[PDB]
Amino acid sequence: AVPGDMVRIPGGTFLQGSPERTLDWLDREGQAFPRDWFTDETPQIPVTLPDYLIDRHQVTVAQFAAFVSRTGYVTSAERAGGSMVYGEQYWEIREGACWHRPAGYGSGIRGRDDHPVVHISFADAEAYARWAGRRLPTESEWERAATGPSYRLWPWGDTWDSRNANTAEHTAGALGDLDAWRTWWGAIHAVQGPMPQTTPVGAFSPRGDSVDGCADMTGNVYEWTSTLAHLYSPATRCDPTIHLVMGRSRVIRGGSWMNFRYQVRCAERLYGDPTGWSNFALGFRCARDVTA
């Protein structure tokens, strides 16, 4: 009895995190962030997991709607009156922004009910998962489902392909160069037109799927996990802003449509305030013990 919307990850021991040679590779790529933005993925540690279940797809708008319809659940963002959207330069609070007003008052989710739901706080995600008879993945369960039983940069392997997922690599490539992409970024925030640039769940299957069958483990939306931020070794050293959230934030995985290839790797780690905060690019999927 594996639910039809989940996949079974076979138990095993795997190397969580990134090897030093990957960080050396990042240092020599044309990308902005310093090495100590990636040392939180180090050192690799052996992690033993049993068989477990994980959702094939991120939770969709339609699915979250049915939860709200049947329970009356009110999300953190609705209680707070606003939620975060990315403007021309920085994250900004947008009044009325929530899962059903993704860009704030004056927007709606019309015709995107197969897209991942967004403006989900950590508590929203746990409430839904609980109602579904499930739970969030741990960080280890998430990475193992992304990279498969051996180390790879992205779920499909070590060679980048902008066609395999919803990331900014596709957009920048479509416009011809990063400069045109930067011009386009400006124009679409003057136009004020669209906001969240999500894609339907499973749109890039099978080519972008993980070896065990999970879709959109690269890009589209960020995903909550249940794991409290921690270093893989007590001696690991990262940017001080990373240390500042250790033991406090929960881990967020998979990058988003806004990211380029380096921030959508299987091992990439990100952290989010679990106390109610959310944004227009942050969703989740569920997992479950094999017997629960």
Binding site: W37, R248, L270, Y271, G272, D273, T275, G276, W277, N279
Partner: peptide, 8 residues
């Protein structure tokens, strides 16, 4: 106050 997304 909120730490938002880290690293930013």
């Amino acid at each position: 106050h909120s730490s938002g997304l880290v690293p930013r």
